[PDB]
């Protein structure tokens, strides 16, 4: 019934392969937070934490290269890339630079590139969930879950065992 809650999240597909949800709850009541470094790379650390065996501070480098590949394949079709306003080539140079922030754009492409579902949970300073944005058709159990906090930071999330 705990996992029934999560399994019963209400996802509205607003654009192909992109869903929004508005549940209300404390992130920490359902997920374990796995804090990531406070450098400019936390988005990639967070993905690394959840996708790579024996993750470390340098693992993110591999996800940044996955992002490059995904971009060459998807960037020019990504609706959100229209907010970036960069040629594919300029974007690649910028994205690849050290300590460059990640975002919902990289999430959308990585989901496609990696064949997985990625969910970004955005929270108030109180760690209450304002919204989830989902890239991919998967559900929360199969997804890579990220926590977006302070409007500027990503950490990794794992579902708590009792709900797994």
């Amino acid at each position: 019934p705990g996992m029934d809650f999560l399994r019963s999240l209400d996802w509205t597909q607003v654009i192909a392969g992109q869903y929004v949800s508005n549940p209300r709850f404390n992130i920490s009541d359902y997920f374990e937070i796995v804090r990531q470094p406070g450098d400019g790379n936390c988005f990639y650390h967070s993905i690394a934490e959840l996708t790579m065996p024996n993750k470390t501070d340098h693992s993110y480098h591999y996800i940044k290269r996955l992002t490059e590949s995904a971009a060459r394949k998807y960037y020019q079709e990504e609706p959100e890339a229209r907010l970036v306003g960069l040629s594919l080539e300029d974007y690649l140079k910028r994205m690849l630079s050290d300590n460059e922030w990640g975002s919902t754009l990289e999430a959308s492409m990585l989901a496609k590139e990696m064949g997985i579902t990625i969910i970004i949970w955005t929270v108030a300073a109180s760690d209450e969930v304002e919204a989830g944005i989902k890239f991919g058709d998967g559900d929360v159990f199969t997804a890579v879950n990220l926590l977006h906090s302070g409007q500027t930071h990503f950490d990794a999330l794992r579902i708590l065992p009792q709900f797994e």
Partner: protein, 75 residues
Amino acid sequence: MQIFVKTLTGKTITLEVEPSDTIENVKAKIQDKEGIPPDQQRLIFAGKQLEDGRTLSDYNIQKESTLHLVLRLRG
């Protein structure tokens, strides 16, 4: 006229608009009512992310139409 915007947090708001207002104009209205910065806004209607330079009429957004607001999240 009036249209509705459902924000990312699920809140439905109303906006005072004309059919000749540009999507960019609309985003600016939303910044004025709800404080959300235009740079973060992705307005969506009938499965399409709306383009800033176009008007509501260009998309056949009629009275009491409901747009969806998704946000660009960096970090």
